[PDB]
Amino acid sequence: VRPLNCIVAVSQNMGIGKNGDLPWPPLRNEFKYFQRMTTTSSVEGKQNLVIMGRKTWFSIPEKNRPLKDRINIVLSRELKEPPRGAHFLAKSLDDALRLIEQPELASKVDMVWIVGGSSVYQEAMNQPGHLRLFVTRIMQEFESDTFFPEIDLGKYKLLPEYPGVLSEVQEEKGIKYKFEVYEKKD
């Protein structure tokens, strides 16, 4: 509800997204990791919350919306009502972050996850205060529309280990990848 966790999978050249779509074919096992981490609350009774840009929301198949057992926030300057299935609409990241700390909510809500789009990652990453970046390194270049903001290594500490995160190289369909956790405190 207070540290901001961003979670992203990123190609070697920093690619995320191609034509409203991922740069790589379905990595189904990497999705498992995304689901367990964003979903796994640390208090029974409380749900984790996800915040995403509007194009990311409509890029999720409708049969998977909202992301289940998580409170779903959509950001949009043009929508007036939440998208069907979304729990909240907010007009800026700041609105979203203020809502989450409200007494009525903060107590239904445990961890806050930024799950994308480029725009939402950039902004989260200009937040002062405690940030974590859960970065899937896809060890391979893929042709991309959009890209992930530079990870300033003076600002972000690579955690050597992190609870429940396995550090060995993984592979699925000939695509190698690994899980990293970065941290910017304060």
Ligand SMILES: NC(=O)C1=CN([C@@H]2O[C@H](COP(=O)(O)OP(=O)(O)OC[C@H]3O[C@@H](n4cnc5c(N)ncnc54)[C@@H](OP(=O)(O)O)[C@@H]3O)[C@@H](O)[C@H]2O)C=CC1
């Ligand atoms: N590799 C990965 O792990 C991930 C990749 N993706 C990919 O990333 C790409 C999507 O990125 P992108 O194009 O940036 O899409 P976004 O999901 O960030 O959507 C951008 C839109 O979200 C709203 N928005 C963004 N920032 C704000 C803000 N600060 N306040 C209010 N509203 C905001 C929009 O609303 P409006 O037009 O309604 O005002 C803006 O047009 C796709 O290719 C997708 O597949 C997505 C998640 C993860």
Ligand SMILES: COc1ccccc1/C(C)=C/c1coc2nc(N)nc(N)c12
């Ligand atoms: C448009 O994509 C999706 C389609 C269906 C369901 C969920 C997602 C999202 C938003 C998938 C992700 C958003 O941030 C992520 N970080 C990592 N490491 N892995 C992921 N799969 C995602």
